[PDB]
Structure 1
């Protein structure tokens, strides 16, 4: 743990990236977090929204 600071820096960055990646799994109000499913399932007028 003596080198904590350095390790800490690394840790923080990783978490950030992880969080960013996890944001791809959120629907943000859409019907599905997967873009391909929305494209293939809905008609263009609503798939656009």
Structure 2
């Protein structure tokens, strides 16, 4: 850990991208997170919400 600051930069960027990708799985208050599924099993007027 001699190169602490540079390794910290790399880790911070990896952390940001990783959490950004993790947010996709989050439900966000809808019936399901995966978008194809929410499209498939509801009518378009209801699925829109």
TM-score scaled by structure 2? Answer: 0.96
Moved over 6 A (4+): none
TM-score scaled by structure 1? Answer: 0.96
Unaligned 5+ runs, structure 2 = none
Tell me, in whole angstroms, the C-alpha distance in 1 between the residues paired with 2:28 and 2:45.
18
